[PDB]
Each structure stands twice: as C-alpha cells, then as structure tokens.
Amino acid sequence: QTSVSPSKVILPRGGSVLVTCSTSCDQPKLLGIETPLPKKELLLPGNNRKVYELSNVQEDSQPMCYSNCPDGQSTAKTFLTVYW
Amino acid sequence: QTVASISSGPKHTQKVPILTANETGATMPVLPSDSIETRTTYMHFNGSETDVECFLGRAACVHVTEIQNKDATGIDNHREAKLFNDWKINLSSLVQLRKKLELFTYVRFDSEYTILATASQPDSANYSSNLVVQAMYVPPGAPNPKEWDDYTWQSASNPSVFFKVGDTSRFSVPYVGLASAYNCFYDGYSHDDAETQYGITVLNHMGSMAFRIVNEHDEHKTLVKIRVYHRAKHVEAWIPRAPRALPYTSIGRTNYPKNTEPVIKKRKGDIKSY
Amino acid sequence: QTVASISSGPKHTQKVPILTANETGATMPVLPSDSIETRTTYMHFNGSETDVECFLGRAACVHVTEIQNKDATGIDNHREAKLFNDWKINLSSLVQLRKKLELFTYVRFDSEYTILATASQPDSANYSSNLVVQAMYVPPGAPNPKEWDDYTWQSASNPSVFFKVGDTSRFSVPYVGLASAYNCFYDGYSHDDAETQYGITVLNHMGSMAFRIVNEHDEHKTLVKIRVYHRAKHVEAWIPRAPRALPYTSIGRTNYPKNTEPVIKKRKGDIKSY
Amino acid sequence: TFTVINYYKDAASTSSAGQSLSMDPSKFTEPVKDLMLKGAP
Amino acid sequence: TFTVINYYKDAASTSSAGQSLSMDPSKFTEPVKDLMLKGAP
Amino acid sequence: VQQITLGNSTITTQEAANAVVCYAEWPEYLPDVDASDVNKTSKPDTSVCRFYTLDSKTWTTGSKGWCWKLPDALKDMGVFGQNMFFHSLGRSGYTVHVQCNATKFHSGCLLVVVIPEHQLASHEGGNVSVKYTFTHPGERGIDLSSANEVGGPVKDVIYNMNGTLLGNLLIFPHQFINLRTNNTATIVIPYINSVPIDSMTRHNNVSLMVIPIAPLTVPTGATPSLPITVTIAPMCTEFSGIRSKSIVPQ
Amino acid sequence: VQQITLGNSTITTQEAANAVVCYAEWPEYLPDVDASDVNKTSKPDTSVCRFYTLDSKTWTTGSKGWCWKLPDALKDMGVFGQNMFFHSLGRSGYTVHVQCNATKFHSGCLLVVVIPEHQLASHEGGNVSVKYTFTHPGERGIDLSSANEVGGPVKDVIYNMNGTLLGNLLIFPHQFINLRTNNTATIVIPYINSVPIDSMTRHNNVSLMVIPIAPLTVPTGATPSLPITVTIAPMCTEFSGIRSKSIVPQ
C-alpha cells in the first residue's frame, strides 16, 4: 500500500518540509505526490520510494502521495500545518 | 495542377452561398468565387509541410541531465552524487512540443531518439577523458539502477547503447502504448476510488532511460551533460483540440497557474481601431 | 488474420470439454469459447518476440576484467600485475542469461562477441594514452599466454582482434561444440570413476579469451576495463525445463546455497484473501 | 528521383512515411447530416 | 520492405534468422497417445 | 417539423432540427476486427435506447455555463444505469438534444459543444487532481458559475476548465442555440476512445458543455431566466463482463 | 482393459491405461543420417525388450519421493545389464510403468515425471559434486526422505534436487497417479541426448521421479502405507563397441 512520511508535520510559515512517498510494490509505474506547493524530487535511487522537498508552505495543505500499486490504498495523505 | 480559384463573373444567384447558419456547427466551404468575381488560379502547392508527419516530426530536446565521472569510493547515494541518472520518458516537459502534441487528443507514433553527450571539466584537469556513456532504455515498470555499478546495467534484456562523449547515439523505439494510441488527454482514473489521481495514467508510459559514465574514475572530475532528442515518426493523430493558451504546471495535467496573465492581447484603441 | 476467438453461443454439450483428467499429463486446449459465450476476435499478433531467437538473442555482458598498461620491468607474475588476463568463455557467470538459457536442456547457437574497452587513469597523468587492446580467442585447450609479451600473442593460428581503447570490436564465432548441441545440463561424468567431477563437462567448452594492452608503458599507469558482450544468434533450443528458483553458487553446477530464503511469497492473509 | 532500401527488419526503423494524400476536411467542417433521411444504423 | 546481402562467406556471420513459422505446442501439451492403436514401431 | 422516436420515447421539434454527427461518424457496434475482449457483448433493447431527460438548468443573465460528462450523467437513468454498474466494460454513442425556447424578443446564444477526453484542470495549480466526486457529478453536472471546492475543477469558462480559450472550442463538434434562430441543438456522438471498449465508471468518454456566449437579454419587465433542458439517448450501446454491481464513491 | 506384451513379459491393466509419449516422439533406432559411430549396432531381441520390475517402495504419509536414473536402474537386469556393461556405446528408449493401487477410501496423488539430464545438486553448496555412487544407485534409486550423505545429492523435493520448484515439474513428460482415478502411470521415453549414442555407464539420459504431491491419507484404522512398484522395458535399444566388460565403482 502507498505510504507517506511524515504522517503529519507542523512547520513554520513559508518553510520547507521533506515528504517521503513509498509503496509496498517494488516496481511502481506511477509514484509521486500531489500538491499545489513548489516541490523538488530529491535525487534518490530506487523505484518504490521518493522524497520531495515541499518548499514555501503558506497554508494548511494535505499533500497526497499517489501510486498505481494495487495493493491496499493506492493514495496516502499527509497533513501540513503552519504556525505564525 | 489543382485549381485554387475558378473564373467567375457577375452572379445574380438565388442560392445565396454567403448567407448561412453557423448555428448548425458546419463550416460551409464558401470560396472567393462566391462573393467576388474571380480569375482562374492554380495552387502549385501540395501541403507537404502541414501533414501531421511533418508538423509533429522533427527532433526536439525532451530531456537534459548532467552526470559525473568521479571517484565513487565512499558514497552512499550515487544518484545524489550524479554518478547516474534515470528519467521516465515523456514528451510533455518541453512546452513547444507539448502544445503541438496537445493539438490532438490521441497520437500514435514511433520514437527516434538521439542522445548527445558533451563533456566539461570545470575544475583543474590535465586532459580531456575519453569517456563512454551507457544509455539504458528500461521497459515500463522495470527496475532502474540503484547505484553506478549496479548489476541492473548488465541487464540481459534492457536495450543499451554505448557511445563516446561528444558523439551521438541514435535508436528507434516502436510505439509501445498498450492502447491503440497514446492518450494525450485522459478524463478518468485508474479505478473507481475517491482519492485516486486524475488524468495522469499508465497508458502513456513510454519507458525510461538511465544514464551513467561507464569509465572508472580519473584523477579529475568530468561533468557530462546528456541531451535526449526525440523525433516522432509514422505519426497518426486523431480528434483536433483547442490549442493550449495558458502555461503548464505539471506533466499529465491540464492545470494552469493561478493569477496568470491575460492571453488575448488588449487593443491599442477601441474596437474600431486598425 | 488469425482468429483468436470464434463466436460461440449457448451450448448444451454432452462432450464436456471442461471436464478432463490431468492425471494423463496432457494440457487439453480448452478455449474461452468452451466455457463462455464468446464473440469473434482476431489475434493481430505473430509472436515474433517470444521466438527463442529473440528471447535468448540480445547482447549481454558476460565477462568484465581490468587490465593495466604499466612499466613491466621487474615483474615476475604479469597475470597478477593485471598486465593481461584470460577467461574461459562461458555464459553462466551472469545469472539473468544463465536462467534464460537454463530454461532449456540443449541449446545450439553461434556467438557474436562485442568487446568494449574503457580506459581510466586514477593516478596523476598528463594525458590520456592512445592504447590498443589485443583480444585473442584461444581455441579450447590451447595454451594461454603466460606473460604480457609472450610469443603466444603472436600465434599464427589464434584469432586476434586489435582495437583502440574506448572503441569496440565485433566478431562472430560459430557453434564450436563437439556434440550437436551444448549441454546446459549434464547428468554424468567424463568417465566411470568414483571421485570424478559431476555435471561440469568439456562438451560445453566454447573457447577462451586473452586480453592485453599492446602498447608499451607510458610514464603513468592506465587502467583498462574490458567488457565482453555475447549475443547468441541462429539459436536452437530443445527440451523445456523448470525455471531456476534458487540462487546459483558455481558455474556448471545446479547447486544452491544452504539456508536460502523461501522463493514462494507468503500470502498477506489466508488462502481466501485477494 | 528518389530511392530507399530498408536496412532493418522492423517497421519502426524506417524513415518517416511522407504525406497522407487523401486529405478531406469535411469530417470537421461539414459534420451536419439530416437525421430524417435515417442515416443512423 | 527489407533487404539483406551476405557480406561474409560464413553462415555464422549472418544476422539472426528471424521467426520459426511452424510453431506447435502439442509436442508438450498433448503428448498422450493410446498405446493400443500400436503407434510404437 | 421533426420527430425522433426511440423505444417508448419521442422528441418532436417544430424547428427543422439539423443534427451534428461528430466527425461525420455514426455510432456503431464494435466490429470484430477491432475487438479485443472475447466475451459476447450485451446489446440492450428499447430498454436503454431511449431519451433520458436530465433536470433543467436555469439560464440567467450572469450564468457561466454547465458541463455534463458522459456516461456519468446517465448512471442513474433507468436500465442503462443498472447495466453500466453491473458490467465491467461498456461503449456507447449518444444523441444529445439540448432544448431552450424563448420569444422573438429574447436574445442570447448558447454554445453546445461535445469535448472528447475533456480532462479538467484543478483550480489549485501545481499537480493537484480533480477528485472523482467532482468529475462524476451525475445528472446535475458541473455548474461553472458556482464557487470552487477543495478537489474540484477550475470554473473559468474563458479557459474551458482546461487551459484552452473558449473561442477555439468550435474545433469540437458543436451547435449554437441562437434564440432568434433555433431553440434546440442535436449532436450525435459516436464512441471515441483509444481502446475499443472501456470501463464506463472510471472514465468519461465525452463532456457536454452548454455555454452562454451571447448573454441572455430578456425583454423589459420579463423574468430574467430561461430553462435549459438536456435530453440524451444512448445509441449502439454495448456491455461486456457482467458481474457483481460496482461500488463507486457517491 | 489393456495388455502390453513384450518378449516373455506382460502387464495387464484394468484401468484404461493412457500412455504419455515424451514430446510425442516414439523411441527409434538411430538413423543413418544422424549416425557418427561406424560400427554396426547390436539390436537385441526379446532378451532385453521386456518388462523389468524394480523392488517396490513403500509410500507412507510422510514420504518425500523417490528418484531413479536410467539406464542405471537396469544395469543389473538380466541380459540388458550385461550388454550395457560389455559395450562401449548404447542408446535406448523406455516404457516406464508405475503401479500403485489402493481402495476408494484412500486419497493421495503421485507425480510421475521423467526429467532428461536431471543434473542433481549437492547439499554442501559451493561447487561440490555429487559422487558417482549416489547418482548411480541402481534399482534402489534415491529416496528423497532419507538423510544427506557426504557426496550425495540434496534431498529437498520442493526444489527437485536441482534448484527448480516442484510445481513447475509439469513442463517435463509426466503423469499423475491419483488414487481416486488411476493406479498406474505409463510414460514412453525416447532416447534424448545431444549426441546420437553415448556411454550408458557414465551418463544417465533421464531420471524418473515419483513424488507424492497430495499426501497419502489412508482410511481410519488402515495400515498407513502403500507400495509403489516401477516396471521398465527398454525400447529400441542399440549397443555398439563390444569389448571387455566395463568396471564401474559399486
């Protein structure tokens, strides 16, 4: 099943956070994170895990990791909160 | 010779071809000969350059990545060190090509790839290395290499091309879509689920390319920039579409950024100005 | 067009094709048209990529060795110094290729070899040398060179190819087995003896390759990595076999390591889970 | 005036196909049909 | 649609042969014969 | 006059209703040469080939437009909806009949357009997706004049909800409902897809957009609205892979 | 019913015994076009073409299976064994008849499979070889349920003693002995080798494996065992290069 780390994070307004998407499938075809934030895929080897630096978080957002893996839930949402 | 215009004199026609009803959704082929007296001219023109094969059919740079040849001893993340790099093949990352392709809903083509490798040695170097690049086409969903000298590179099945830096490789890939054509637009989901991704689909998986420098390290670091050029050939296109007006924001989505600038130019003057 | 499925309606058959006896060891060709009402579809498919010629038929790296070009004055063991290296040809050292070949008992093919030489100069060097590699195919059982500049390299009979480092050589070797096909599996011995080796046989001797850098030494040391790529062509295969499930441990043996991990994945749930 | 030999066994390897002769825009410009002449199957 | 000239005298030098047309799995899937019809030599 | 009778349904039009057949292609059953799925298809009778009328929209002076997605809009329509839910695969054409009558004193122009693969844009930007519930609204469709929702599509009719300009939407099969000229529009849609048949639930083959281009101008003192009614009939519908009824969200 | 009479031997079966002919190829004498050895071959009479019964194995609830190698299992069988020892070269087909009868209350399923070039794995790993004495056991064969021996093969039936999974052994010519259905299995094996003829002593052409797949479940209070009997007849046997009798270990 698709997984996101962290499950939840509280971060300062405008800061960056690293969100990890992972699958149980070893070889997923689609794996990413859906978010309106500016993001940067960290150079990381492998197919079933990705890390994104979601930059300049301004509001409460719910970035969703997605995949095409058919085991379990193919999507996982994380909850970003801003404090200011 | 194909006639462009026929000779036509005064007309007191009761079958008015210039009065129609656009409410019907048809563009009736009204010609100059219908509203003005015309002479007879010839086309002298076949329209060879407007055929979809030519319109969508020259090589365009669709990916650029830099990889390095350096001492790999004592590095955990080779991908981060840019010892190798992989890329899920897509023709959406360059906007000129994307807009041209997005003029159609379904597109079917074979792919001709040209990979150009160019070396640079910014730091002090005594000479220019004779480096060899391995460009490995990995089939859709196949495992990408995880380290620079992983055994995935020695795959007995993945197509690989070895070429010198500074030179090019060229190889064609047939149309590899599951369906009869690529879905440049997909108004659906992979399955009936409340949270699943919209639009982006596995139907349009064209494969992936992994790149490394085969050579072991020299005393200096060499930076290699790999440019992948894609040329579509044997192109078939269906269902013309409204051209893209707004900037893109992501691959596989029709999203556009918030607060975009107006597309339609404002007139310098009123509606009567020329 | 070859028919994949024929139109078939309701069936009140007394010649039940779906009840059989697997005790007989035959896979009776029961089709979808036998158990469900079907429409008529066509294959649109020849199965060109499942032919053994294609399945076992692309170039794979089957050996990699590093040799050196350095001052050879005052060295007793040139082989240890990596001035040259030899290798008994075998397609068993890479597991992907081995498993594919081991899907069959007997295999007959001609060999197309591609040797890629790539140079590296890790230590301080003022320039990159223009080195030439000699890849010498030695027939089965023929003497391998014993030193870097031995007279064995000047053999008037051994096929040799000279090519620049950074470039490739390509040459085909016909099927060279004594028997009508290679024995990818051999359940026997070379002769009736109590202590003699099992399985590994001289029937499958494909030759050997020796490699050296022809150039005399420069002021610096150059490390050359030689990758041998084998491509089987004109492939004939007999007697399909159970695929390999466990890791390999040696060439020519079916041995697997002790305490290996289970092959069959365990179910996340009971036998009823989907 | 022009010559091509196919050097490879695959259709994907051939150069571009050229021009689609039979081009007709009525598919898009004149898609109107009277539905009272029973053109529907 | 396709052309090959043999440039070398050896059969081992030719490119791959292509596809074995006459493929039939009954060798492996239907190897059962009644031994009471005397099929044995 | 004109009359179209499908099954137990009939639409009469005192306008000389000229129909647009998208790309001059009539709906047709999947031929053998194009078929991949081997199961014998279920070709329903009068029970599905009939006009289903959706609930009417009100066209006001400031309404932006409406969007329906097929076959989603008919998922709850009599026998067709049931078959769409009970089968794994389905393909269908449509006869769309958009109706909007007024007097000779009204002015306004609707653009009725059918967009194959009308992938909607999200109003949030980046790579956010439009959620299933918003792209499968049902017979109510999407009202472009309402406000944005979390996970909903963008609703600026100028950009067709996809980043293309409205003026260019005439490249798709369309008809105008010009209140001075005509009160009905008829578009016959064939099955359009890269695959011969597909899942009717997770994929919307076409989108029907009814967009006011020339705004509604009612005569002085008149009620400032007109009802727009959409009537659809499945045509050459096929179903394959009957099984337990699918479970979709909402 | 069925009856096969070879020489002075006869096997009668009240089951409609259907025979598997490996790869739909009957045993045949070496044709001239394939022959390399020039000597006129010795084609024995009734003296060898006959059914030899091996000693019976006992099938218990916890037995893993048995493996015989041909022609090794027949090296001590009447005239065939002598000819196999006196000649330098030999090729032969086989008619294997595996017999296991029970009542309608027993359950269990044997997989009778013929593996050409069944190169056995050593249980020690690395590159250790299985010694001659273990791969040439004779009419007793290899019992997969016994313990490992120094120089013996590995005996985990799940991996076929060669590193392949048991489930996949159906790619080879096989028959099941399903106690509810049948009590006998018949496989006709042709000569299979990369060479037209070979030394019968140092090389085993085929391996016969009888493996319990569905375990033996005897009725309540019944003796928890069944005998399994293997009967083999050489077919189209040829010998070449007669000389002094070979000396093999054990």
Add this chain to the structure above:
Amino acid sequence: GLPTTTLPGSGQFLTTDDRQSPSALPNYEPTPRIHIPGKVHNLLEIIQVDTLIPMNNTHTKDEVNSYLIPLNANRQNEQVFGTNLFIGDGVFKTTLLGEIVQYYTHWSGSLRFSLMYTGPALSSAKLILAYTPPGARGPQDRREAMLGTHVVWDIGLQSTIVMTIPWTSGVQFRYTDPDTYTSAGFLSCWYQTSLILPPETTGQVYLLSFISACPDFKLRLMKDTQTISQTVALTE
C-alpha cells in the same frame, strides 16, 4: 571512393542491433544437427503447458503443502480460495506461466485454470469456480461470486475441471507487473453444495490448482526478470 556521409549513432554499440559480423573461425564446419525431441520454437508453445499453482502460500517456508488447497467436509456456502489475477505476481510468480511472463512487460489473452481433486473416490463435492472481471472487488460471498463468469464443478469420475479466464479488458494489453488500471480481476472458488467424505475417512482432502495460457496468449516487451539476482560474478 563512393562519397558517404556518416550519420549520428556511428560507432555506437547498441545491444540489440543484430547485424552481420566477420567470423573469427573462417571455414569452420560445425557438428551436424541431429534430431533431438522436444524442440522449442516459441515460448508461447511452452506457456500453454499446465503447471501447479502454489495457491496455499500461507506457510513460512516453501513446502509441497503450498500446492495443496485444503477442502473441509460439511462446509456450506463457503469459500475455498480466492486470489487476484496478477499473473506475474503473488501465487503466480513462481509458476511456469508467471516465470515466462516476468520476462515481458505486456500480456494479453486468456488463461486456463484447472483444479484436480485428490480426495477419496467415495467422496462427493460440487464447487463453483468464479472469475470476477475487473472493476468489482473480490467477491466476499458466493452470491456475489456467481454473478460473474463461473463454472459449477461436480466432482466425480472426471476429477479435473478446466475453467478458462476469458480475456476481459478494454485496453488491448495489460502490464505483467501489478497495476490498478490494467487489473485483471479476481479468481475465487466456493462450495456449491458441500464436501461429503465416506465413513472411515476424516481430515482434509486437497485440490491441486494448475495455470496455463490459452493459444490466444500474447507477450510483447522484453524485460529482465526480478526472480533471480546476483551481486558477484560466478566461477567454476
């Protein structure tokens, strides 16, 4: 000299090009081809042979028991087994079909699923084997299962049922690796009536499940198999 223009890709080593090349052993005459039985022309020939499915893959180690589907007496309206139909994964990964399938990326066509009953001759059972095409969940009760493709199997003198899983898809090819869009559906088996054992017999009887390909099977895009791996070159 014939004027020529070298094109891009000149001097490249593409591992799949398959051109003529000079022979290192000119005039060599290879051993003549003798008749060897069981010649394989195409891999589509061998995938059509049934091999056992480790359907009961609930054990910590690999055992023969992994291939035995337990059947219990006096079970009513109950499920025997259920699996998804990702043929290049799960219970199918190790079968011959799955192994050959993992060497390719795309697959199309119908599958042949077989069950062999191994219980005593004096037992009786009616089972219903159901194929649920994609789009619906794995059936959780027999009623749900019997709305799709199914076969009611009466165990008797013919101990083997052969149900075909018809190619049931919109898209013409499915991915051999598990994917939501190209999901192939579900396979389940249920007790139609029940299993009845004769007196003097007790315990579990077993089914053997086999998988194979129908002659309409297709495999397209070659890839490496993830079944076997190596980190070091092997030697003799």
Add this chain to the structure above:
Amino acid sequence: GLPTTTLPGSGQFLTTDDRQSPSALPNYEPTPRIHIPGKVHNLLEIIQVDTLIPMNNTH
C-alpha cells in the same frame, strides 16, 4: 572493403534529417490500429473550421 570517401557533415546531428535507425525493441509488435473517428492527416484540414475571433479585445 568498398572504397569510400566521407563527406563534410559526417558525424553531424541535424535535427531534421529523418533517416533509418536501428530499433531498440526488435521483433516488437505494436497494438493494432483500431478505428478512431476524427483522424487528422493535414493541418490544412482543421484550419478550415471556423472559430470565434476575440474581436472586442478592449477588456
């Protein structure tokens, strides 16, 4: 060896040359072409369809 003379431009990558090239997926059989309506052969076919002009571009 056929005597040849390499011309200028040898080894150049011209982005519009359109020559034959070796296939990376030999023997691959692409999905058959099904009938999809609205096939576009030439762009001169689609420019003949009327689209609205933003003539009142004064906003």
